[PDB]
Amino acid sequence: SKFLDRFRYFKQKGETFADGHGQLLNTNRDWEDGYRQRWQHDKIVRSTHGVGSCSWKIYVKNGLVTWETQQTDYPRTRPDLPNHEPRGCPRGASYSWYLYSANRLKYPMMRKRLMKMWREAKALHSDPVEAWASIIEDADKAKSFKQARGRGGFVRSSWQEVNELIAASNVYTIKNYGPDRVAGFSPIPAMSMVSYASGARYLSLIGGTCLSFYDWYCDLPPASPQTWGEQTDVPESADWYNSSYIIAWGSNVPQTRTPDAHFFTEVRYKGTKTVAVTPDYAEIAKLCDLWLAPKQGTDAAMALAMGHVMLREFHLDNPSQYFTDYVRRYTDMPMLVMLEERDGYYAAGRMLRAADLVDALGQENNPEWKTVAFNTNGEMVAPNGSIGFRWGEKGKWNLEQRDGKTGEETELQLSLLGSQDEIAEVGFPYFGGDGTEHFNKVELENVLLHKLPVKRLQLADGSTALVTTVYDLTLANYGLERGLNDVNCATSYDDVKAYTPAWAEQITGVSRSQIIRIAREFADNADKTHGRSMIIVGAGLNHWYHLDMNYRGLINMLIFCGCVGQSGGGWAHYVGQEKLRPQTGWQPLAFALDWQRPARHMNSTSYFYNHSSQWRYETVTAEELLSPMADKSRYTGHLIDFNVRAERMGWLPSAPQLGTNPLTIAGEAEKAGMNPVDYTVKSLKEGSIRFAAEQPENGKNHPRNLFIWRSNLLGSSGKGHEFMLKYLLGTEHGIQGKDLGQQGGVKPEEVDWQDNGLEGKLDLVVTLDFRLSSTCLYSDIILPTATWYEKDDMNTSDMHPFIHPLSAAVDPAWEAKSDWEIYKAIAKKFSEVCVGHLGKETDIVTLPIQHDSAAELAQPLDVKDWKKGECDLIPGKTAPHIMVVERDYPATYERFTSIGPLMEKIGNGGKGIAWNTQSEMDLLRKLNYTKAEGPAKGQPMLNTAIDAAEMILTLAPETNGQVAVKAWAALSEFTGRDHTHLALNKEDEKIRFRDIQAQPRKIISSPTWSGLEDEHVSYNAGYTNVHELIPWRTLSGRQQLYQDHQWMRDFGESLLVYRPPIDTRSVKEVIGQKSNGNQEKALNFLTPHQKWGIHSTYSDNLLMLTLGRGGPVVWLSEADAKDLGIADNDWIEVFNSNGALTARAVVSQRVPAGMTMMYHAQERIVNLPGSEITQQRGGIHNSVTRITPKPTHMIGGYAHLAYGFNYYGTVGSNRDEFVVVRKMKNIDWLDGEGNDQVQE
Amino acid sequence: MQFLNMFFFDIYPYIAGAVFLIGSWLRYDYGQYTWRAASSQMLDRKGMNLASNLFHIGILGIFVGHFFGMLTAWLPIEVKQKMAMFAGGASGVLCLIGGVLLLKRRLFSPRVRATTTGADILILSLLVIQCALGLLTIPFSAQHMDGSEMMKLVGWAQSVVTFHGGASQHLDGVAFIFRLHLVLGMTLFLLFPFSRLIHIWSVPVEYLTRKYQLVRARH
Amino acid sequence: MKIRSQVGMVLNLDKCIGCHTCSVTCKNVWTSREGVEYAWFNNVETKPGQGFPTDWENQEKYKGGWIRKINGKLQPRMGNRAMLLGKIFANPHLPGIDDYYEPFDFDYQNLHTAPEGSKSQPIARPRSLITGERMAKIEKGPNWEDDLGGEFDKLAKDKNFDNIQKAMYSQFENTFMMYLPRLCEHCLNPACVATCPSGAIYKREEDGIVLIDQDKCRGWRMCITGCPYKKIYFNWKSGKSEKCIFCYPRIEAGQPTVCSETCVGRIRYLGVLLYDADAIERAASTENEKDLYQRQLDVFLDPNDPKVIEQAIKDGIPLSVIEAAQQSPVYKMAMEWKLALPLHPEYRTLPMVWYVPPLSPIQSAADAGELGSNGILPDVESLRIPVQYLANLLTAGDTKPVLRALKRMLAMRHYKRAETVDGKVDTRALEEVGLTEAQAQEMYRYLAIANYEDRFVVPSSHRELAREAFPEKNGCGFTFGDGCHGSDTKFNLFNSRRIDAIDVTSKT
């Protein structure tokens, strides 16, 4: 009795202490069980998150998921390195909130209007394909549900009803227009491989389009493919610990790479110096030894000046033995460049090829693809490594300093200065004088002439020409005086020349003494340590229109100091977890390459620029981007015209591909008495068949069915939000500006024009998600999917070498299903619904010229447009490959659920190599069992996500030591050097799904990557190139400083140069037009990755919203806010020609005047009032952006500049954007609640 | 009438008394987590300082008066009554004002209303009523300044607490208003163990002599 | 002389990245219930700022902590026993819900149920978790000032800016910010325990964790005012107060707290500290507040001293705890290297959660500067965070101990760079700060590498001692409702018996 216990009062009094200040009591403490029983749980399950890569402990209590804490049992790193545990971040810690919250999607849902018509149609049409026809072909019916998008009316449906509608619509679209009119968008597969593969596999089997993501998000740094012929390979976070000098340039590490931040904070204790370069005082500055703040968008300038000081002091004045040898062996600096004749001066042309010389330097194979240089004895030579040795021959594609003819050791020379025949003056473009009124400029000359030590040579065709080295061209471009009395070269760092510290100080605002001190310290460290200097770079630089220059500026500094390929040094780019390591095990699964080849990949930026009709509002011209030394008449047309040409030349992919159903081509080729390939080539030449890109609005060349999963596309990722709503969805929109037609602008010369653009192109939008997102809100059908804690899958990252799983702690709640089971069931329904409409069809598929394939050696000297008679139409060389693919539609499900025969028939491979994988398939038959009968009888099964994962683990070299050894052996053929020793000591290694559930496993060194998985050295990008002499997949086989492609030269990007931020002209035409009484002001609009969410995921999570500002907000400097009369947290409106958004202000001192920042994505479903500008619900950050492509990101069929899914293509950069900002007056919620406010 | 009289003043007082005691004991042993004052101050501080102090200081004045007046030459019955009418009268005025302010708050202060329980509204309303009734008995006691009325009520009270039957007889002829006050007052003891009034049992007397630091040993 | 033990905690502010993971994991486990949804046992504040609750450091307004009277005796700032009792009907200093923030939620379901034919896109508006009514606008949150969110003149009201010419810090180029993660200090002389009229708050003898007994608490809500760190939160629904419980359910078996093991930055260290309970009053009542820091250090005992060992044994400290104390990272940082300092020692509570001050980028200067005593690395004098600010936070205004900690950390960096970059032994900076090569080496092991087994050295609370673990092992958790838990007397009105006990006594 607690009552009776009160009587043992003084009996429970123990000794006093501290001289009567305290009393020790011996009283009951049983009540403490109250908190103990909360902590206790049923079990713990290991899982992670899908779109950091951190393994978590999922706690289940009372049969429900209650919370999570990080797993800390990762394999430990070397004793001299800190370990990874516990990793994690705040977003991840709050995920459990989603499982049973109020915004959980529990049942499949369909727009009421669409359901009403669907059921009435089925009542009049027994066949679902015909029922769908009756609805979609009736303009009034189609529009009734397309306009209901985003306007409420969702009703509960069922898996049976939605699967039939989806299947019917898919069949109808494929049959009447083409498989490529069906598309799917899903991002970053590395976070949940199988979940991504599910939809991609269904789409690939039926012929639909698989949209890209690395370029779409603008996480892809085009400079990487340019310099190294590699999409993105970077050192792991642990490797930062091996660096003794680090610059965090435009990277907010603690906020964007949270679980890895400790390596940066901890390495400081080892003596490493850290420097932060960010316009604002960000979290990253808090952790550095020095904070430099240049004007945003002007970073390339600072890098150029730093490079200037490094070259001057470590390459010229006091030559660094390390640096000198490094650039000699690993760069294209010794390579020779042909000078082109102009009136009064010369211009750098394409690099000299062995084919240009009389006896082709004794080279019969691909002579026009082998660069040339001089050796220490003035003798000319074609060294090993150039991309010409990669195909057609074996044994010479390596970085051994040898003569490509005699196989003898040589020593390339760097500068011709001291052996030149004469001194020619070469012109270099200078853009540092242009720019808007928001950035400081430095007037010089559009063309800066420099004195270059040339050397005349006798060409193989009788003519003669002048040549120089990339090295000489580089020193000149930087403005280094070399005794030739060059007026434009600097005489000191104070001399305001083209690219001096004094010059940079004016443009960036960063003190010249700081630029000099750090450039010096950085280079000195690299020299002492042999390359242990590193630059971590992020979206602060990669999201600008000229991201290529910012990056090349940083890349050069690193190369000049020999930091690339050395542990603790190099280029560390982190923006998106693009690194799915078991690549060649996953690709066949994801794109059904085990059944059919090739698939239909497409680069999303061009795809949406085209189909959401953002080109109809383009304000940027190619003309204003051309070099001042280019023939402006050869580059006429709209930016979209350049894309269309790139497409027909086999440079970029297309989607839809042809203006005619590709399933009907074969049937016409037969009647014409000729095979499909030839019939297509001839029809294209004659114009009877055309690329769909030419007429995107004719009614048959736009996509009609779109699948969206693991994405919030139409709500955060989608640049040009208002355009997508208008043209793709056909719903109300907030666009403010007028299109080309309304302004009387000039129409493109490759694409048809019409005053009234086609609206509501999508017939059916299907979204899979566990929460009702902004995208679901605008969809026709919403499918409840399993959360990351309710399904099995795998995850890998570029931050560490571990492969770990996602696991179902409990079965998917309510009616949710995993992505794999959702698409498997769609496939099953499709397979029966298509009977009688589609059978064993023949498909004609176009495939752009592929990087890492023999065909990458397309057009060696210039650009020829067959469409303009400049050459013959040769598929795979001057146009895309024309492939024939057989599809067994009724067998879609059986193929989806089994590993195809192509793995055994053809084999497997990637990145330019192939191997036999029969043993792996035999193993898989035992692990997954096999089909007892039917079309896939005898083939390994793929019924569960686990089976799919084991397929990935068994086929990939990163997870199967047996395959890893065959992979390296195949590569050894090309290089003539043995590389199998890189995996022989792990040949018995085989990673299993159930084993990674017990403990994350480190992967195996693979030729797919250039870093190594070893116990003595950390993983560092480019390490195999520098240490195994494997060439970078570039024209020269070395790090490319000089881009000699015609377009690169004419657009002024052959060598790096400063390029000021571009003008989007999105503000002046709307500012003031719709006054509300408060002052308006134009500000630079920046959108860095937020702190309370991953893109938009978590943006609706109550925990994240509570720790943030309760919903969408925007940051402004105190000055700008005070100027506009904006107090902290006031409602404000941001807008321009592309649309408008509403948010609450966050006034802060750490935001520099002139700029505003709305952290990337806070989407459109929470706490947003009506807009005073559009009279609609306020928009989001992408309501004020719009896609604007850059020509150089379209180059194809040129060695390192050839296509690859997520490897190259146009990017959606938009930090150059400006918006009008103002305080809101009326705050109307448009919900009929009567709860509106007025700000005064 | 005679039946209702014996019920309310001979029977009822013992029913309410048993429920008050056994109910308190049982809720103490099996409801420790429910034994609190249930402060609402944080949700709405406005007016609470004035209101709560007026009510508690007043209600405590009343309690002291009632306790020593009904359960106890230099202090004859008529002197005791004069004290009750003025001292007790003033206390009841402070109490009633505070009580009314607290009730207004509890009923119309959004955060307090949204989070209150029914028993909280019921118990406070009844105390405001009981306090108002108490004050209304003053003009009646004024008609018998010789303490004739008080003598009856005190006769009843002491008969009840000493378990002497016939307690109702002492009340023969007392003004009706006194009847009401007595019944409502006893009812509050009946509802006592099922409301927030249990906080009263916990008046923190031990604190005045307690050592500052407390440490509990393994147990 | 009475030796007691406690697992202390040290947070290295130099490594904190201000991510809040620690805050989320605590919330998910302990405070997701209605009534404490607004409570964050662990919360991270960005400085400069006023924190959560707003201006909690202002004791003149909030009346938290202790004061030393002229006669030398200690008394809660709230007042003596009589004074405190006199404020019971309405605590005049009590922080209101608005001083924290009004907890909110959103109407997500409106996104699901919006009717067909809406004139605009449906949206989820905020709703109060206190009233259930629509909120016109969210005006506050627990981390509202995160990353300098707010005007400088607003953030500068920061109590720690006292006696500092703060004008210069409103200049863009002089901007500075740092993070202050905080939880309950589990003090040796807790003010909450002394200000609770019912005696419901207590310090556990075996591990020094301070708890509010949920059975005995009466909701007098005076403790909230009493705590100078404002770490006790009133549960508006249950009517009782709650606070960080140092995750005793895990500590009891030797595990780290949730916020410690989930710290992404790897900044938290857990280790045993042995202290003389008999010296608590003497130390907390020293006349000069700038001496409280050192006076508390003197209360901590040397775990390797055989004299302390024997007394500890005699006083009942388990052997494993003594052993844990001998390898305590907290002891090394607070006693040996002097890197860790208390949070506001002037409150006189003898706090047990300490902090290592943060380093920061050098201050803005006319030119790129020159090499200093540390070469290309910084010298303590160049740091942009005003040391006086750090001193007001950690050392009652005395900058000496703050500078020593920062200097020593920079020295470690200098020595390590010489070694790993130049390949030389250069102990110049070490000798300047009074450190040996071995000490810098150990500092590097714990601060840089920071292996899991080194950050957390938590011993068992030995729940078997002085109790009967066997019947408990066999019957704990069967919560059928025997009604016998919570009291020592066996008699009970419902005529029942404890499920986890043995009622049939041995007759042998």
Ligand code: HEM
């Ligand atoms: C069972 C409980 C109670 C009993 C038996 C009781 C009895 C009485 C009696 C007999 C009187 C008239 C005094 C006289 O003889 O002159 C009185 C007066 C009064 N009572 Fe009560 N009472 C009770 C409870 C309460 C409570 C709970 C309150 C407060 C809400 C209250 C407030 C008053 C006031 C304001 C007066 C008039 C002035 C005074 O005599 O102090 N009573 N009560």
Ligand code: SF4
């Ligand atoms: S969201 Fe990403 S970074 Fe955060 S805990 Fe999950 S996996 Fe790690």
Ligand code: SF4
């Ligand atoms: S010790 Fe435990 S209860 Fe206290 S703040 Fe940390 S996680 Fe929360």
Ligand code: SF4
């Ligand atoms: S988890 Fe660690 S690093 Fe992150 S805010 Fe909390 S204490 Fe700082």
Ligand code: F3S
């Ligand atoms: S002052 Fe003690 S509400 Fe605070 S511990 Fe609860 S009765």
